[PDB]
Amino acid sequence: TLSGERREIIRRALNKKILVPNILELMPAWPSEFQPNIDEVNVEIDEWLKTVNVAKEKKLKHRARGNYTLLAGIYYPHCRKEKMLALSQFLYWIFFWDDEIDDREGTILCCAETNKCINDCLGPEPNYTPPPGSRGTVEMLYPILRDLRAGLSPVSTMRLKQELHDYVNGVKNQQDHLPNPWDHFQMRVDDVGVIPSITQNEYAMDFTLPDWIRRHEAMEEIVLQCTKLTILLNEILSLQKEFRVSQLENLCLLFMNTYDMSIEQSIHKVLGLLKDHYKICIEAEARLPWSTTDEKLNNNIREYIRGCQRLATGTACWSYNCERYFKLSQLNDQQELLLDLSR
Ligand SMILES: CC(C)=CCC/C(C)=C/CC/C(C)=C/CSP(=O)(O)OP(=O)(O)O
Ligand SMILES: [Mg+2]
């Protein structure tokens, strides 16, 4: 039965302490940087948060523990200051949205109102006014999508539209055995909401990758590998948080269930998977359609793949610099995380 399978996992992982190596070391060629105006933008974000129709205590818990302006600052360390507000706001949207919707009918209603908002704002007849009904996490999305679209070409807008629809519908669609690990991992590859952040590098850096390059197999592979990398490192980094509220559909635990690995072996398996996909990602760059003549085009290709890589390294770097997933005291002097599956 479900309970039996979930029972044994809780028993097998409970109170386990697992020291995790510094994940950024597994991606050595990809550096972590910080946008230089994070503090100043956070002042603006704090004032803006006062008007978001989310509960004060909830907005402050997100700001205090997740501090998504910092995540935007690591994803987009070289953007100009004026781009940082909309990037940070979007990240507060997606984490607030995910939180409120984390009841079948409520999820169905909100997803449809959110898809409506996405179409309203990014589609062929733009309407940025929220309907009078709108719940807080939908009402706040209209000005965010409007501001992003103002800095995007219609080519990038179409990609952001489809990527946001994919994320929304992945959440709606996900509602006797724990799931198979590959099934879970592949589900997160399809549904995880990292791809709108790759596209927002085009807002952040004020460029458009041509679609013929975006559809090239090497670019498609770099986007995919970086999506897989972000997910994999998140499986490890979020394990303590997820296990503490007994959300056992965590890749590490699914490896424990399906293959009877220890929690130590399972985490080591995910780390191996990160090394494989990083090496695959690195190989794809030589296959990209680099121009022999066009400096601007090659700077755009460069920037776009750096956006992809910073999603992987930046997600890690941010997790090591906030308390969304663990207490920062759990990191030692060389940034090894001591997971604690106590509860
Ligand atoms: C960390 C990561 C993969 C991405 C950060 C940047 C973006 C755009 C993430 C997608 C949005 C959400 C809700 C991620 C939560 S996965 P979780 O493990 O942090 O939260 P959960 O434990 O599933 O509630
Ligand atoms: Mg997770």
Coordinates of C-alpha atoms and ligand atoms in Angstrom, one line a residue, residues 71 75 90-91 94-95 98 102 167 188 192-195 197 230-231 233-235 238 241-242 247 311 315 318-319 324-325, ligand 1:
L71 CA 18.0 35.2 -6.7
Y75 CA 20.5 34.8 -12.3
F90 CA 8.2 38.0 -11.1
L91 CA 10.1 35.7 -8.7
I94 CA 5.9 32.6 -8.8
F95 CA 6.8 31.7 -5.3
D98 CA 3.1 28.3 -5.9
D102 CA 0.4 24.1 -3.2
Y167 CA 4.2 25.8 -15.9
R188 CA 9.9 17.9 -13.1
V192 CA 9.4 22.8 -13.5
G193 CA 9.1 26.6 -13.8
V194 CA 12.8 27.4 -14.6
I195 CA 12.4 28.1 -18.4
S197 CA 13.8 32.5 -16.1
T230 CA 18.8 22.9 -11.6
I231 CA 16.3 20.2 -10.7
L233 CA 20.7 20.0 -7.3
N234 CA 17.4 21.1 -6.0
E235 CA 16.4 17.5 -5.1
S238 CA 15.4 20.8 -0.7
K241 CA 12.6 20.9 3.9
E242 CA 10.5 18.4 1.9
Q247 CA 6.6 15.4 1.0
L311 CA 19.9 29.1 -13.6
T315 CA 19.8 28.3 -7.9
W318 CA 21.0 31.3 -3.8
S319 CA 20.1 28.2 -1.8
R324 CA 14.5 28.7 2.3
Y325 CA 15.8 25.1 2.5
Ligands
LIG1 C1 14.9 26.2 -6.8 C2 14.5 26.0 -8.2 C3 14.3 24.7 -8.8 C4 14.2 27.1 -8.9 C5 14.3 28.5 -8.4 C6 13.8 29.5 -9.4 C7 12.5 29.1 -10.0 C8 11.9 29.8 -11.1 C9 11.9 28.0 -9.5 C10 10.5 27.5 -10.0 C11 9.4 28.0 -9.0 C12 9.3 27.1 -7.8 C13 7.9 27.1 -7.1 C14 10.2 26.3 -7.4 C15 9.9 25.4 -6.1 S1 10.8 23.8 -6.2 P1 11.4 23.7 -4.2 O1 12.1 22.5 -3.9 O2 12.4 24.9 -3.9 O3 10.1 23.9 -3.3 P2 9.2 22.7 -2.8 O4 10.0 21.9 -1.8 O5 8.8 21.9 -4.0 O6 8.0 23.4 -2.2

